[PDB]
Structure formats: C-alpha cells, structure tokens
Amino acid sequence: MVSQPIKLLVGLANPGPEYAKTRHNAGAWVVEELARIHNVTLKNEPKFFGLTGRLLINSQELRVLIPTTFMNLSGKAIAALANFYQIKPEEIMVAHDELDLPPGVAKFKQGGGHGGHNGLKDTISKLGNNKEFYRLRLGIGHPGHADKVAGYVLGKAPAKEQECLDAAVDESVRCLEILMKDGLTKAQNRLHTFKAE
C-alpha cells in the first residue's frame, strides 16, 4: 500500500496554446487533470524550464512538472527540477504520447527505449543516460507511414478520437491516485484492463 516509487510526475509537452491539444501533449493532459482535481495551479519557474507544482496524495508528496521547453529539450527541465530536489531517475514517472498503443489505452512501464520520441530521448540523455525512469504511455495511435509520424503527433485528434483520449487521461489520473494509495502493482493491474469504447 504505502510504498511506491514516484516522487515526480512529468507531463511532456510543447509550449503554448497552439500545441496544447495536439497529440504530442498527451502527457501534459494527465498532469493538468491531476493538478486540477487536487486544486493546484502550476507555477512558471524559469529555473526549472517549466510549470511546477506540489500535490499531497494519500500523505505522499508528489511534485509535478510540465516543461515549457521544446519537446526535444524536455530533459533540461526534468534534470533541473530532479537535481534540485534530489529525485532519482527511478523516482520519476514521465507521461507521454505513445504511438504504439491505440487511443483509449494507457500503460505504466519502467524503463525501455525512447521509441523515437524526442522528449523521451532527451530525458534519457539529460538524466545521465539513464533509461530507468517510469513511463505513463498514453496511446495515440500511429499513421500508416513513418514519414507521416511527425505531422500526426503535431496534429489535433478529431472529436471522437479525442473522447477516447480524454477517457484514458481520466483513468490514468484515477490510477495515479491508486498508485499513491495501493502502490504500482495494483495501479497497473487496473490501468491495463482499461480500454475506452
């Protein structure tokens, strides 16, 4: 129950209103919703290259971060904040859009590659070439063709598809609450049975 590894939750993003509802900001959506439910307004802290907060959830202290960097420079923010607060890579969960899962699905994972995701790739680099941070993989689906991936992830999902996304965001937030109460195994056990329809 009370033991779980996460001290910092990061939602990857590109900055500003034109990118806010693009697929590549899916991780930020999770952080935004968790903050909203827990009555925290994020603070722009230039020292941390991002928007930051602190939540108390089942007596566990959870810091949150939405970088204001380019997506490919996300690691600057994550490292700056984690090094200041003495948070290890293994105590970070990074929420991000996942091409290899469909809209409406999300999964937790420890470690792994970047999958060609520019934010994950920088995060690995800037955390001392350490892959062993946790991930919240928010499915966004994948276009046919490799050459279309950048355009796809920088696009806005159409309405019905966005409903599936928003439903997975919602469950992901519920399951982050469960992570903080019941631990990772039970949180994962619930999240991995979810599929938005």
SS3 69: coil
Note the resolution in Å, 1 decimal.
1.6
Backbone angles phi, psi at 54, to 5 degrees: -140, 130
How far is it, in rounded angstroms, from Cα 114 to Cα 127?
13
- In the chain, how long is the greatest CA-to-CA distance? 46
Name the nearest CA neighbour of 172 among 121, 103, 71, 116.
103
Q: Which domain holds residue 9?
A: 1-197
SS3 175: helix
Of 24, 38, 96, 145, which residue is the catalytic one? 24
- Annotated active-site residue 24? The verdict is yes
What's the CA dihedral at 28, 112, 156, 190 to 10 degrees?
A: -70
Is 152 marked within a binding site? no
Q: Please calculate the CA angle 19-21-25 and round it to the nearest 5 degrees.
A: 70
* CB contact at 8 A, 94 and 61: no
Is 19 marked within a binding site? yes
Q: At what angle do helices 118-126 and 74-84 cross, to 10 degrees?
A: 40
Question: Cα(first)–Cα(last) distance of the chain, in Å?
Answer: 30
Is 118 marked within a binding site? yes
SS3 65: strand
Burial 75-93 (b: 16+ CB within 10 A, else e): bbbbbbbbeeeebebebbb
Number of domains, the chain:
1
* CB contact at 8 A, 85 and 31: no
Q: At what angle do helices 159-182 and 26-37 cross, to 10 degrees?
A: 60
SS3 24: helix
How far is it, in rounded angstroms, from Cα 50 to Cα 140?
24
CATH number of the domain bearing residue 137:
3.40.50.1470
Q: How far is CA 147 from the centre of its chain?
A: 24
Name the nearest CA neighbour of 98 among 111, 110, 114.
114
**Joined tokens for residue 57:** 């959830």
Backbone angles phi, psi at 7, to 5 degrees: -105, -20
